[PDB]
Amino acid sequence: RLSLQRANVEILAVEDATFSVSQADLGETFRGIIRSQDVRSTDRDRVKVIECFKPGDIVRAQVLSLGDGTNYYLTTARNDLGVVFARAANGAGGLMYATDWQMMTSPVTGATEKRKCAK
Amino acid sequence: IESNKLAGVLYESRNVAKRRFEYSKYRPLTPSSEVYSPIEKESPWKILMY
Amino acid sequence: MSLSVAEKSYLYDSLASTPSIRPDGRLPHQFRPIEIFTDFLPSSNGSSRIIASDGSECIVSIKSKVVDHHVENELLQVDVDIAGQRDDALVVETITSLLNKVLKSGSGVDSSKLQLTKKYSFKIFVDVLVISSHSHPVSLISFAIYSALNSTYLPKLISEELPTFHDYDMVKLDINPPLVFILAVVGNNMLLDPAANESEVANNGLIISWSNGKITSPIRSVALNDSNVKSFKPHLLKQGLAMVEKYAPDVVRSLEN
Amino acid sequence: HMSTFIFPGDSFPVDPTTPVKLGPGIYCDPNTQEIRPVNTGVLHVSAKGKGVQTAYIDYSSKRYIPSVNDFVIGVIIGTFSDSYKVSLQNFSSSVSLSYMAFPNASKKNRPTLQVGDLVYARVCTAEKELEAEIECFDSTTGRDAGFGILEDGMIIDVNLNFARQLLFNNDFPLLKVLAAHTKFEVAIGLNGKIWVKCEELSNTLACYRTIMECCQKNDTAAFKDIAKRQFKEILT
Amino acid sequence: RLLGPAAAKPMAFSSEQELSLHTGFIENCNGSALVEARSLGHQTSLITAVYGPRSIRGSFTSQGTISIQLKNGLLEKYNTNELKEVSSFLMGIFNSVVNLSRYPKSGIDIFVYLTYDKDLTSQISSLIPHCITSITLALADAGIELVDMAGAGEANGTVVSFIKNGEEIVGFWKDDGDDEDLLECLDRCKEQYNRYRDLMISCLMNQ
Amino acid sequence: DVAIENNTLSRYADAGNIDTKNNILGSNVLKSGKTIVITSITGGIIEET
Amino acid sequence: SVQAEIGILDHVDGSSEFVSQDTKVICSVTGPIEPKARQELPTQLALEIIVRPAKGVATTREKVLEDKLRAVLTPLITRHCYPRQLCQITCQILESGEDEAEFSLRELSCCINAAFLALVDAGIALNSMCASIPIAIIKDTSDIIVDPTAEQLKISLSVHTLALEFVNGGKVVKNVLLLDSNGDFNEDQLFSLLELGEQKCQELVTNIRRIIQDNISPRLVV
Amino acid sequence: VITITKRNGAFQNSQIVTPGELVTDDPIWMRGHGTYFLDNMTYSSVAGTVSRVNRLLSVIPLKGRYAPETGDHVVGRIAEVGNKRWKVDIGGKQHAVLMLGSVNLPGGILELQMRSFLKEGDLLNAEVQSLFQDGSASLHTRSLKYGKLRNGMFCQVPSSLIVRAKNHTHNLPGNITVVLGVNGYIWLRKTSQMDLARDTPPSITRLEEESSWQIYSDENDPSISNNIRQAICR
Amino acid sequence: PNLIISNVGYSELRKPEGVISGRKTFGDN
Amino acid sequence: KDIEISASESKFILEALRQNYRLDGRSFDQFRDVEITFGKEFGDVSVKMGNTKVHCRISCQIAQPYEDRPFEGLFVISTEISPMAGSQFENGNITGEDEVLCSRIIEKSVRRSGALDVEGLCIVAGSKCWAVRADVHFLDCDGGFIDASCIAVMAGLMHFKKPDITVHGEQIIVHPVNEREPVPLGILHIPICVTFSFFNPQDTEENIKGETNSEISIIDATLKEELLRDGVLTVTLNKNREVVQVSKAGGLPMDALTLMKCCHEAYSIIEKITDQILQLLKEDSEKRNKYAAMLTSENARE
Amino acid sequence: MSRLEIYSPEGLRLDGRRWNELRRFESSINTHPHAADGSSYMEQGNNKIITLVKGPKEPRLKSQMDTSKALLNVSVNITKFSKFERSKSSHKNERRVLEIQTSLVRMFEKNVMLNIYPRTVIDIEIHVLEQDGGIMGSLINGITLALIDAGISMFDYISGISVGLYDTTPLLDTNSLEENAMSTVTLGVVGKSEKLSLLLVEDKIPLDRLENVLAIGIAGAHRVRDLMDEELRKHAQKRVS
Amino acid sequence: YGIVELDPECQMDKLNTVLIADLDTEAEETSIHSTISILAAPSGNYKQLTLVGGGAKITPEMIKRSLLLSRVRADDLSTRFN
């Protein structure tokens, strides 16, 4: 889910590299929330989450404080954190690759979409 | 009177007229809506640092 | 029930000590005052309403029907309905299946005491209605069906043809109704008839059935709470089991009165 | 200057060489990168050299989709802490009307709007992946005339085609045939809402009955006879 | 669900205990098992699956919550009232064996399918010691923590479940049977509990 | 690959020693890969007019 | 010759009524609207397909009818342009036109056509067009005939419900949407009816396009 | 031994006004609780007695619950933990709210882990600070005297049986301290260090108290006297 | 590859160019 | 998931009623013009009154009679509302208060009130009987749900024809539809439902103890008039001056004189709707039996 | 029983009463001070109804909660042993029962001042131990006396009376044998007025006779109000003193 | 069976599609939007066929291949144990 000031996600893996597949879709899976204040490293007060993430993108974010009443607190205020895998037009296009820090482009389709890349 | 809320407004009016002024040094320790002081914070300089 | 962990440790430490101090101060062999009303439903043969000290109230109605015992297996069907709980709820079907075993036609109650002709016999319908409950009511329903069965009157038989019954006279239901008791173990002490707060911090629970001055077959050892669930020494199993053998006659003397 | 009836999946009568500015009804495939219609309606094009060309499809619809720069009528259904919650159409999703989106807005004073109030605003955010947003003042130009609470009156539910042909097409003989019978003020919403208001309730009701009858009747030249009979019926 | 026409009637016709133990062979859940027992004129064949642990959204409990459910298979269909009665007795036992404090704000769902219960000549008393040994194998395969193995035995209706090499009793169940048969029924199941206890470990260590 | 077991859970499993109390007419325990399929068949009768 | 009317309901975004032989199906499309919790899709549009029989409640017979109709409309709608949205598509079968217990092919063929028509009137993004026809073979002549009557089904050996997808003025067939068959047939008869079914659906969309133009065009600039 | 009361035959064993009747026709009155104005005449909405205090006309119902008023010392357990506020069960018609700024936090100004030191079901005592429009009460724990209860047992009495006095809590013989709440929630605990040392016996701009989580810990007192626990049960 | 500008709404396609009054009060007559 | 009504729209319709105005232009006692569309097979009736459209389907089958009434047949009816008539109806909610109150009113009007001849539906006592089923399909909701549904079921039962059955002692042979002409069901009286919607320009207090009745009653409300409705009443009469059934629960507590007035106003309505169904059934019969004048066997002499 | 005389020329009914006489009315207040805040054991004739009122309290879930009024829930449970023949069906989820439960909620949500108790829910639990005709009216009188015991503000009394029409003779308070031989009408009169909050007619009645049936119906309902009112006077006076 | 459409971005005018037999695992059932399920009888007879072409285009090539690949599947199953 994409909100104006947050972005609801769904925890799929975790590392200590090696990972671990989550629960196989249906609910009762670990979910988190990336607050707008922890999206980027610079200008943490004014950001546009619509220009950072889109529904259906795999995002690598580090957890923060555990106020796990329902969700988790994540952050992407680094270089190696952000969108690591996405597709054009929310899955309706081609597989895009992270070029710049906030610019993702698909080679075949040639279209560009603004993300929060991680390279 | 048609809304039958007249007694509720007059009851709150009494609590406003029963308000009492008191200096900051001799104010009650328990925070109350009946007493008033220019300084009602235990450490007033803490809300300025934050 | 729902309590705080601060007071749960206080009741746990006070009930597991060697003095075995109870919350209300009653002795481990004592009970709470109970009010029982009988015979108030003219449309039914037997009836009873029981009221506990903590507020638990249960009503029991008894109906009868002539049925061929050669084709009718069970002659004592118990229908339990708890208010606020679904008919298919997990806590309702367990007592429904448990009471059908303590009052099984032939085991808990002999079928010879309700036979008519060599072909037909009376079928007893025990309808249970729990208005309110704060603990496990299997011991309270047993006290209600006891006074209801001992206050039941069925029509008299007149005598292979279809049986005929008298218009005015009705015979009394001479049936020994089994009794069910609840026991809670707290560490190393036995507690007969626990309370809502005693059973909430207890370690395990015991259900004993008493019939004909003896401990009969249908007994259980279900846990009273999912929080503190502990295994018990076999010496505790026989301690509380033999403990009811001493005070149950004092229960029947006060209940059959 | 070409206008022809097309269908979803039909070929697009536009050369790829010419620069194009597509709009509603036309979709760009994220894979094949071709341009195909997805709606059934009249295909409108306009080739002009000054040198941009545009193309869109005018289709019949009643479910409103939030689009930017649209004049919409909404009903306030919730009061949050930093914004309102408005309903542009039943069953549809909600839109956000912030307290700061008002003339002379300030943190100190909140707008005097309560639930159930009809508002007239401009769609400032219509993202597909986000909640739509409206505002009672054009944040791009500063305009604010007409925007605000529509006190009293009566609202009318019409299709989206009847709303655009009434706001943009100045040749639609509805406001002209209505003003010839009684003085009124109208509020045209692109979400299929037409708010009217007269001095007497008898005139407001007559405006409600004409717009309803003219919404289902496709004959435009029959609007004169509808109001002629409708305003005559209220006289009994 | 078709069930066919309602005008159709069902058909009406006028020492040593072998054991089989298995585990796994299920990909939906985390841990499963399969116990089979053939002795005298009665056979038992039931499958147990453990779907857990699953994190509960919005929960704040201090320890886990076990959910055991017995479902009628295809032969000797018991009544639904007695199925949940044994389940409540099974939950009363495993709430003291499974490490509940290790899995906060989460629950564990148990699914036991009494597929083939057959008699060749209360009938559920003989099946209880076989259901307990099937859940312990399935709970251990799912990586769930259990305080010591849990088993049970039968002694003419009386079913007693022991733990810690039979030192402490975790559950007690009795239906039908006789009177005053207590210490002998305990030792008949105490030696039977050890027969099922070491056999579960022998199957859980093979490859 | 598949592996099946017919007449395994039926009353007529042993053609010489029939079951005393059973209702299933036939069975088939099919397994393809890691999936398990159990198919029992019960019997009834209807009176037609 | 079949009959069809568009825009008959006042409280849905799009409505339709498809009449063929004796089968009559009224469909209603409403969307995009706010979905429920278990229905919303993060990227694309959600579909709530519901079909109902003429007599009795909705049994499991209509459940497979929903799942087959769902597979026809799902690739036909551009779902990705309505993220986190819902579209209710309800099909009400007024008259079956066959035997409900022994057959269920004519109702599937009319629900597909009625749903596509209601999807056009509601203004939903459609990648192409759709056409569905029932096909059966009489055991006498063993030849393929389209839209068989109720008496022709009881003598049929195998039934067919072919659903196609047309583009470029209702001429080029992009993909075969649905071809559900049940009975007795071989590979020689499969392409014997698939080639015949492609030219009977081509004149159907050509007849559908004429119908959906005689009603949408007057409502627009006219 | 058991004492069982038995019956047989039956199912069981000022100005009084009823809802719907006329109490007065004098408009010169102030309509109070249990009273609805209508057509310049006054009627009663509940069954009870008529009260005429000053010009305030009200009806006192027979069975009445607890009415939360400003400045009441009550006892209640936490029902749920919300967003920076905890709904506490006082026993009234609704759940009283407890904002995060109404309790003494040990960290202070320096953290949404509210359930760590105060979860659901935990019992405590506080004072009613104010009321809401719908009648809901707002509590606060800005005093050392108000804290999380422990070292005792909880009981409940009807709300209409608690008399309002000066000191809400009292010290009793046998090293026992009683906490009487006007809502009907009594807490019988052993005398602590606080209730024992207080209940029985120009350049200053005030300072802030430094209170740790010592009063929020669920850890009860280790050694409680066996002679004292039998007094609490008595 | 084509010369594509993002799909625009219905209002930006018109000719008045945002000088449209959505709420027109018809006084007198 | 529910209809949102603006405060401006709510105030306008109430004040319009205070000036004897309805948005659709009817009167306070004007029932919507009813239209009956008969389908192909017998028992296929489509009713259209105003913008509300409803469709009923009549069927029957052999079933076991009740143990307490072995000489009567069964009458089943279920009105499950689909999202077709509006997205406010959640599909699968068969326990809805509207669906519950609709079925119970028609069931009392047809079965309990003796509209359908249940005794004539008995083939063999306590074994075989007819179980007539009435499936009502709500197509487009605009108020008057139970008013149109009752018209659809009554027009459907009078248009439906049950299969012919010959009894040979204990056997029962159901004659195919092509073998023998089906026999129509027996109908004693024609219950027709008329609903009344109530409004108060005052409030609840001025209505409990208020002699001055300022209530506004309208006959057959629309959807917008129904959402702003305060009190609801449903009566059912027949052309025999008999009150079939009455259901009034909640809303504005009205007096006996106004409820009696509602019945006399509803009788003039049901009397006209009755003769229309009798006329439209007569016209539909001549549509199917065009040459029925030549096929008559019982003919008069001279 | 058998073939009885419903209304003989001597004006006597099958149970001895006359045309305008009521069955014995023995109501009881505060019968469950440990199970609900409101309690009423209604014993109208052979009928024996237990009515509980749990509230107003917080809802068990914050999902359904009206921030401007209260939620009124009615749970009518007809026991299996309500009649002579023990019921074999389920009764709880019966369609006839849901109609009664809804008709009771609408009847009282307009009479109970739900506005005085916002953001709350009022649960009404009913258990019928025995029935004998006119069960709907006795359900009405039980809820009225049970809410008053709970201290819920109401505008007036709601009285439940049942009237039957045998040929040309109305009969007050119909029992089971009378309902199985004539048409039945249950009324819901508000206080001493003629305002009807309930009007259920489930059998055919001539229009020329319904008005007189309603007049004699509301007249007997007022008599039912006084018997409930006099019960509250006696209960309040003995409780204070 | 299933008809899967490849892509050049995972190891280019047009492309080539492949046919997968007996779909399994969550990966195939979720992504493959074009399947063919058929009932094959001996002597070249078929009893039921479902042809859904949501994903890739179903060419007559893969129609004939799925039919012939099912006739051998029905012969092995009918002659597996009996």
Author numbering:
A (entry chain I): 145 to 160, 186 to 193, 196 to 290
B (entry chain J): 381 to 430
C (entry chain E): 1 to 159, 167 to 264
D (entry chain G): 0 to 49, 51 to 236
E (entry chain F): 8 to 21, 42 to 148, 163 to 248
F (entry chain C): 51 to 99
G (entry chain D): 2 to 223
H (entry chain H): 4 to 16, 52 to 148, 156 to 246, 267 to 299
Reproduce, without paraphrasing, sentences from the article in which this PDB structure was first reported.
The eukaryotic RNA exosome is a conserved and essential multisubunit complex that carries out diverse functions in RNA metabolism, ranging from normal turnover, processing and maturation, to quality control. In yeast, its 9-subunit core (Exo9) forms a donut-shaped scaffold that recruits two 3’ to 5’ exoribonucleases, Dis3 (aka Rrp44) and Rrp6.
The crystal structure of Exo12Dis3exo-endo-/Rrp6exo-/Mpp6Min was determined to a resolution of 3.3 Å using a synthetic RNA with two 3’ ends. Analogous to the previous structure, one RNA 3’ end is anchored in the Dis3 active site with Dis3 adopting a ‘direct access’ conformation while the other 3’ end is anchored in the Rrp6 active site of an adjacent complex. Mpp6Minimal interacts with an extended surface across the S1/KH subunit, Rrp40. Electron densities for Mpp6 residues 90 to 118 were evident on the surface of Rrp40. Mpp6 residues Leu92, Ile93 and Ile94 reside in the first beta strand and are nestled into a hydrophobic surface of the Rrp40 NTD. RNA binding activities likely contribute, however alignment of Exo12Dis3exo-endo-/Rrp6exo-/Mpp6Min with Exo11Dis3exo-endo-/Rrp6exo- reveals changes in the orientation of the Rrp6 catalytic module (CAT) relative to Exo9 with Rrp6 CAT tilted by 15 degrees to a more open configuration in the complex containing Mpp6.
